[PDB]
Design a protein around this ligand. Structure first.
Ligand SMILES: OC[C@H]1O[C@H](O[C@H]2[C@H](O)[C@@H](O)[C@@H](O)O[C@@H]2CO)[C@H](O)[C@@H](O)[C@@H]1O
Length: 585
């Protein structure tokens, strides 16, 4: 690793980035290898978490906040002379918790691309597209085709009439205020699902299918970004780039991306990556070498944007950009994108209704997703030596057992845990002291939810306080638990590679059970009786649980492999201290 490895998406001008790398090698003899693996935004966090991966990563800024909170990105500290060369708003896109975590490259915004020969007057509104499609279908052509597998391309329509991802409240994105299932979101998605049902589009259209059909003159319109103009030029189709159509009188609001280059925190060539990006790529000569391969958009480098801003296609990119919103860079963006992706794919295929698709996305958009959990998960698994495959087998087993015996619906805990000051109790030393604080606090009518770890069951019975929820792996004294379970307590049973025995044993004899697993696949495994809210120990898992179900504020009242679990606990508890009030007792 005496050289530079660079990762950028396959739809970008990586050949042009290689040209810059060749010049870097020419002057410093440092070989530069540009790669474009599939799903690089998801592969990088995995390879980087261990110390592997490229030296420089390229992607829209929206993923970089999750990379930084995981500690995967070195902090960039360019001289003020260099920062002044880039627009300040592009720097803001890559600032996370006051630290710049990447170099901004170019502003990406989707635009409407139309065939002038097939359609010299592109439509101004979505509503008039169905009439245009049947009209074009009389000539063997379609009106519109674009990638329906990535929510990036359908979000402009979903957001036109009021849809939003996370409310921007008082200078901060409120991860609790998600707007993917409000009136506007449903309206936008419905119009898109109607387009499929009415045969104006196919739910199967993906990137390649849409690009092929448009560049072959089969469809009159597509929706894509500046990177796609290069292939359209080669296809000889006479195209134009214009403003996206309006929906219900309101403009389409595409999430605007800023292509950014992050430096791997484990890379041993940090200073080399710094000089390459600052002195080779982010120059008029360097950005253009990339731009002539595949257009970047509105570049962040001021000197080079003055020339591109004259291009009418770039003019439309910014007009569409000004009507949308720069994406957040917060770590929860990964969860939002998965939620919307699944909702669209499910509502498009008809396999699920628009109402239920968005309602499911609403829950899991703000819910912690297995993206910042992949980091903690495997870190804990090999640190203790747990068998990753056994966490699978136990999670699956737990699910099948709950399919036919004595379940409680998830939203009944949502009935308890919401807008309330939930009490979380571990088996700590001050349990009796803090339980005394709570009792005299509950004795005065401040009677709000109570979630307790397994080892605290008997510690609560003795004061005749029946916990509302109990998080347990069914390891120790189960008698105290069982008594609580029928006096009202809901039991959240957690799957453990070392607990598969007692799962099959004690579960069927319990009432009011909800499933838990640590495994991060499960959603892809399509397990519907278990859930991974996040967390390692019963204590911290209680916190993820209350958080997962929209709890206002947490209130807590609780051989090295015993000391090392208490560290992951505080590690994971501090993780949520920036997402929910966490007042200790
Ligand atoms: O579809 C969700 C996806 O949207 C964006 O991905 C864009 C990216 O910004 C573009 O530069 C280019 O790579 O096309 C992608 C669409 O497939 C977000 O940047 C990305 O995080 C998100 O998952």
């Amino acid at each position: 690793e005496g050289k530079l490895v660079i990762w950028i998406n396959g739809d970008k001008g990586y050949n042009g980035l290689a040209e810059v790398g060749k010049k870097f090698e020419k002057d410093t003899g440092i070989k530069v290898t540009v790669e474009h693996p599939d799903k690089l935004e998801e592969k990088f966090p995995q390879v980087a978490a261990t110390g592997d991966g490229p030296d420089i990563i390229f992607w829209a800024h929206d993923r970089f906040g999750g990379y930084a909170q995981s500690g995967l990105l070195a902090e960039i500290t360019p001289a003020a002379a260099f920062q002044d060369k880039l627009y300040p708003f592009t720097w803001d896109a890559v600032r996370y918790n006051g630290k710049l975590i990447a170099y901004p490259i170019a502003v990406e915004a989707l635009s409407l691309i139309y065939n002038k020969d097939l359609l010299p007057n592109p439509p101004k509104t979505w509503e008039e597209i169905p009439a245009l499609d049947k009209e074009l279908k009389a000539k063997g052509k379609s009106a519109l085709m674009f990638n329906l597998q990535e929510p990036y391309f359908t979000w402009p329509l979903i957001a036109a009439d009021g849809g939003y991802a996370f409310k921007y409240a008082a200078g901060k994105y409120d991860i609790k205020d998600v707007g993917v299932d409000n009136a506007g979101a449903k309206a936008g998605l419905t119009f898109l699902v109607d387009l499929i049902k009415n045969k104006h589009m196919n739910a199967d259209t993906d990137y390649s299918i849409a690009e092929a059909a448009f560049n072959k003159g089969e469809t009159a319109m597509t929706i894509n970004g500046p990177w796609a103009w290069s292939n359209i030029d080669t296809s000889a189709v006479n195209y134009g780039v214009t403003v996206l159509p309006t929906f219900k009188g309101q403009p389409s609001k595409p999430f605007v991306g800023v292509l950014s280059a992050g430096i791997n925190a484990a890379s041993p060539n940090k200073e080399l990556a710094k000089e390459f990006l600052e002195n080779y790529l982010l120059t008029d000569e360097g950005l253009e070498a990339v731009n002539k391969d595949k257009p970047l958009g509105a570049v962040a480098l001021k000197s080079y944007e003055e020339e591109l801003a004259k291009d009418p296609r770039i003019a439309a990119t910014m007009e569409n950009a000004q009507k949308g919103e720069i994406m957040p860079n917060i770590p929860q963006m990964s969860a939002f994108w998965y939620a919307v992706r699944t909702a669209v794919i499910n509502a498009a295929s008809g396999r699920q209704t628009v109402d239920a698709a968005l309602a499911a996305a609403q829950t899991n958009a703000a819910a912690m997703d297995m993206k910042e959990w992949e980091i903690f998960y495997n870190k804990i698994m090999e640190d203790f030596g747990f068998d990753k495959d056994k966490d699978v087998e136990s999670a699956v087993i737990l699910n099948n057992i709950l399919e036919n015996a004595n379940t409680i619906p998830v939203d009944k805990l949502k009935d308890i845990i919401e807008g309330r000051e939930v009490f979380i109790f571990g088996a700590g030393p001050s349990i009796k002291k803090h339980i005394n604080i709570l009792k005299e606090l509950r004795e005065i009518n401040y009677k709000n939810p109570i979630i307790v770890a397994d080892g605290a069951c008997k510690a609560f019975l003795e004061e005749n306080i029946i916990p509302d929820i109990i998080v347990s792996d069914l390891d120790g004294d189960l008698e105290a638990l069982f008594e609580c379970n029928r006096k009202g307590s809901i039991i959240v049973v957690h799957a453990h590679g070392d607990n598969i025995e007692k799962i099959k044993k004690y579960v069927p004899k319990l009432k009011n059970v909800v499933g838990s697993c640590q495994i991060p696949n499960y959603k892809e495994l399509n397990l519907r009786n278990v859930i991974n809210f996040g967390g390692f120990t019963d204590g911290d898992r209680c916190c993820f649980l209350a958080y997962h179900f929209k709890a206002k504020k947490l209130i807590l009242g609780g051989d090295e492999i015993k000391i090392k679990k208490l560290e992951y606990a505080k590690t994971l508890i501090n993780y949520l201290k920036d997402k929910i009030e966490i007042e200790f007792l």
